[PDB]
Design a protein around this ligand. Structure first.
Ligand SMILES: [Cl-]
Ligand SMILES: [Cl-]
Lengths: 214, 209
């Protein structure tokens, strides 16, 4: 063989969940298989991995000689190659742009708010009171952004016209909230949204592959 | 025609450059509304854009936010404009990688330099520590972009929206007094970007010279 399938390196349950769902949708809707390599937090600090990707980040998508990082770049690339796959929830430019706007909001803005809850800023280590303040302020910021997504769901079923990469991104962040013990139950559209997303075959397959069921 | 709401010299410079390229390359004019920090808190603005942020692109009854969504939307509408530095899927994606790095990763390190976290106001030592960490983060990320430019003249195969984004961030560094003279490629990169007609037009419109 002279052409191998595309390969995604990802951390199970991390933001790389999103291009994983994208590739599964491509497999299901355009019959193109792909490879998934689950990486550990240590393997990405490894010599072998930094030889592929100096930023030592996931996701990484390899397609032949192209070694592409950034979730948004990866998904827009898969959408150019496979428009029939409707990764942005639609084939039309205006509806695709609206879903891309939600994807960028989730990836650039909301994701960032989680950072201090996953890794406390070094200057608060050992400072009990500042640690509590930082964690509460970040929780408040997440919930403020999630209210905005909740408001959208008051009259839409998904963040695309049909299910899209943006729904995959919110889905995984609400999975983080559950794992972190961050209660969003007062945002009434979110739990029903989680259930709809989990019913999607590609999402289901990826949750299974990444070990995310409970 | 389309209208862009932007804060002069802010991240909204990038879709402003994109529209000017569409103007120059695809013969489609657009409107630019410069907004103040107060106007984006206004009742009139919040009604258009409940997020109260810029950029905002209005195209008919489409009101689109987020820099990346805006530029991907214009690229779809005007592929001949080569907003990503190329027409081919692989080369466009490489440039979109850089755009996303600059928008999601690098821009974020600047945030505390423009707006200190609430918990740090009044606390002299902590404020100093937060500003130091931001500068260190920025310099590490700029070093990575600088390394790329040792073998490539732009972040696209030709000039692209990724280049515009790095350009405006280096303009912020100059305004913040964050020096990057030790990164040998950046000065020359800024001159190449300033030499492009679309960029030059936008810098003029936004009062940035
Ligand atoms: Cl990257
Ligand atoms: Cl937004």
């Amino acid at each position: 063989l002279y052409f191998q399938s595309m390969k995604l390196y990802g951390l199970t349950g991390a933001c790389s969940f999103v291009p994983h769902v994208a590739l599964e949708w491509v497999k299901l809707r355009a019959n193109q298989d792909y490879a998934f390599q689950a990486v550990s937090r240590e393997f990405i600090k490894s010599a072998e991995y930094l030889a592929l990707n100096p930023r030592g980040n996931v996701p990484l998508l390899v397609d032949g000689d192209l070694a592409l990082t950034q979730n948004q770049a990866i998904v827009h690339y898969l959408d150019e190659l496979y428009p029939e796959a409707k990764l942005f929830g639609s084939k039309t430019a205006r509806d695709k742009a609206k879903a891309a706007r939600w994807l960028a909001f989730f990836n650039s803005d909301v994701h960032k708010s989680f950072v201090p809850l996953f890794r406390l800023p070094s200057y608060a280590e050992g400072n009990e009171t500042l640690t509590k303040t930082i964690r509460q302020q970040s929780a408040e910021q997440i919930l403020e952004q999630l209210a905005f997504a909740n408001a959208h769901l008051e009259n839409h079923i998904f963040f695309g016209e049909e299910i899209s990469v943006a729904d995959a991104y919110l889905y995984i962040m609400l999975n983080w909230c559950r794992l972190l013990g961050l209660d969003f139950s007062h945002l009434s559209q979110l739990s029903a949204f989680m259930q709809r997303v989990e019913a999607d075959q590609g999402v289901d397959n990826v949750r299974e592959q990444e070990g995310l069921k409970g």
